[PDB]
Amino acid sequence: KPNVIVILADDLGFGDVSAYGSTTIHTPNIDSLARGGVCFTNGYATSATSTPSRYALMTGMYPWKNKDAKILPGDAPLIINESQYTLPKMMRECGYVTGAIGKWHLGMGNGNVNWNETVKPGAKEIGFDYSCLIAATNDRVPTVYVENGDVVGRDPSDPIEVSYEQNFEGEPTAISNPEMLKMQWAHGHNNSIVNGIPRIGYMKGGKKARWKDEDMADYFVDKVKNFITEHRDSSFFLYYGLHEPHVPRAPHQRFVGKTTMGPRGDAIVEADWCVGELLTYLKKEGLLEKTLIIFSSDNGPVLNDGYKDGAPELAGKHAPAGGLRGGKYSLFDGGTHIPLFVYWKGKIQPVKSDALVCQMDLLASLGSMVGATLPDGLDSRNYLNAFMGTELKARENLIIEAQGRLGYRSGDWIMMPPYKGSQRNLTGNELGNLDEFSLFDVKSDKGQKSNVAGRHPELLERLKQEFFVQTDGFYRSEVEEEPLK
Ligand SMILES: O=S(=O)(O)OC[C@H]1O[C@@H](O)[C@H](O)[C@@H](O)[C@H]1O
Numbered sequence: 384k385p386n387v388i389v390i391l392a393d394d395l396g397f398g399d400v401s402a403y404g405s406t407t408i409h410t411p412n413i414d415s416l417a418r419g420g421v422c423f424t425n426g427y428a429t430s431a432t433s434t435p436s437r438y439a440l441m442t443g444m445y446p447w448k449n450k451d452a453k454i455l456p457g458d459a460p461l462i463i464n465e466s467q468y469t470l471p472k473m474m475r476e477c478g479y480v481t482g483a484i485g486k487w488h489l490g491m492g493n494g495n496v497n498w499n500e501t502v503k504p505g506a507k508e509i510g511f512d513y514s515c516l517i518a519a520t521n522d523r524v525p526t527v528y529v530e531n532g533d534v535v536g537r538d539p540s541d542p543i544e545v546s547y548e549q550n551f552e553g554e555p556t557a558i559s560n561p562e563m564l565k566m567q568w569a570h571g572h573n574n575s576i577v578n579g580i581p582r583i584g585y586m587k588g589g590k591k592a593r594w595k596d597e598d599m600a601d602y603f604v605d606k607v608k609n610f611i612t613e614h615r616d617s618s619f620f621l622y623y624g625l626h627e628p629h630v631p632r633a634p635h636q637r638f639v640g641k642t643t644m645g646p647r648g649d650a651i652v653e654a655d656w657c658v659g660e661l662l663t664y665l666k667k668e669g670l671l672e673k674t675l676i677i678f679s680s681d682n683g684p685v686l687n688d689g690y691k692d693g694a695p696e697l698a699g700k701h702a703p704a705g706g707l708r709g710g711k712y713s714l715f716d717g718g719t720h721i722p723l724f725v726y727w728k729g730k731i732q733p734v735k736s737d738a739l740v741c742q743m744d745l746l747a748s749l750g751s752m753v754g755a756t757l758p759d760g761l762d763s764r765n766y767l768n769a770f771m772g773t774e775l776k777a778r779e780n781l782i783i784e785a786q787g788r789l790g791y792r793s794g795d796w797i798m799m800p801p802y803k804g805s806q807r808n809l810t811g812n813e814l815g816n817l818d819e820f821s822l823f824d825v826k827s828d829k830g831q832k833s834n835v836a837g838r839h840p841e842l843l844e845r846l847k848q849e850f851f852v853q854t855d856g857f858y859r860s861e862v863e864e865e866p867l868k
């Protein structure tokens with residue numbers, strides 16, 4: 384029973400840490416988990432977007448088995464059943480105090496959230512004893528903190544209303560009042576304005592509750608330190624959802640100019656500082672040697688994701704997906720293949736593993752560690768030994784997902800079905816919409832340059848058979864292209 388901390392960054396690409404040898408960014412605090420722990424070269428989220436990757440981590444279920452597991456608005460209902468087995472529920476029944484701090488994006492309420500009372504079901508009802516959260520994303524209304532289902536700084540004399548349907552009569556928008564903007568929108572992100580930054584969706588009221596983006600990193604770090612100190616004498620499971628480098632990239636003043644890459648780079652150094660502050664505080668509390676730390680990212684990277692923040696102009700030679708094709712929103716490997724480090728000081732011996740592992744496996748793997756009785760019916764597989772770096776093999780195969788489109792990794796091979804859709808979305812990311820069943824040897828062709836399906840017809844038919852069996856009932860040959868907000 385060590386403490387367990389799952390740290391998720393938000394769109395942090397395979398090439399957005401220096402752990403794998405990048406010359407174009409420096410993430411020393413994050414790299415210390417990688418070098419001093421298990422550094423996974425073949426670590427995966429299930430999905431190339433937030434809500435589905437986070438759903439798979441929390442439930443141990445493939446998210447494409449839930450029709451609601453896609454990018455959620457801030458007023459979306461909770462997509463996990465109140466009765467369903469979850470990572471925090473398991474840890475709690477095995478003697479842990481549970482906390483979720485930072486990004487949520489799994490939904491809250493039952494479709495008519497009153498932001499002025501306790502919002503249920505939420506984190507509390509899926510097994511987090513403590514929560515202090517962003518409902519959806521830092522670019523989505525409501526721009527407030529939700530602590531155990533209550534909006535921080537709410538006020539009956541300035542009540543909060545949210546709509547993703549239309550503006551509140553009388554309320555300024557990015558379009559009505561462009562003079563109020565300190566950051567320009569590039570596409571979407573042109574509804575309500577908060578702290579000079581235009582957002583997705585419309586918000587009225589709660590002047591007191593409205594967050595300040597530049598102090599968000601510090602506010603969650605302080606909630607994390609409060610949680611650790613409150614529970615230092617107990618076994619705790621903390622889910623720490625960093626907002627960086629998700630748009631808007633408005634990091635604290637002290638991080639501005641730390642990089643050559645504008646707000647995007649500066650937000651990554653902000654996240655690295657949060658990780659450094661966590662490690663420092665664990666050392667201070669004397670907990671480092673009894674705390675298992677898992678660091679990862681919900682999905683692959685993106686430069687321009689809706690704001691004129693200089694990300695494409697100032698990227699220079701920086702390859703955020705570190706040589707992988709695509710990125711956020713892509714069915715190519717850069718969508719799901721993310722940094723993944725597992726660290727336990729004095730227990731795990733430093734290792735670089737090529738084991739095919741997925742965030743979805745943490746529920747069954749941690750379950751094995753703490754002696755859980757798992758229900759039947761989870762996708763989550765027990766690979767505890769691979770996660771501890773004791774064994775260098777885990778999965779033979781993994782399904783990957785990009786906004787409802789599915790593909791297949793099996794050993795050194797990726798099979799992508801063909802899908803009708805755009806080559807790129809407005810971000811410039813390649814979506815992985817190909818015209819034929821394609822096959823990539825990712826041992827030799829890391830960057831998925833070449834569809835070699837033609838010279839491997841036997842292997843292709845087999846990978847198609849296995850993919851159809853695992854996805855039947857969920858796989859859709861035609862998937863609606865969801866517009867960026
Ligand atoms: O990391 S995620 O939460 O999946 O990102 C969600 C994205 O949704 C898109 O509609 C917006 O254009 C992006 O700016 C971003 O907010």
Ligand SMILES: [Ca+2]
Nearest residue numbers: 393394433681
């Ligand atoms: Ca994300």
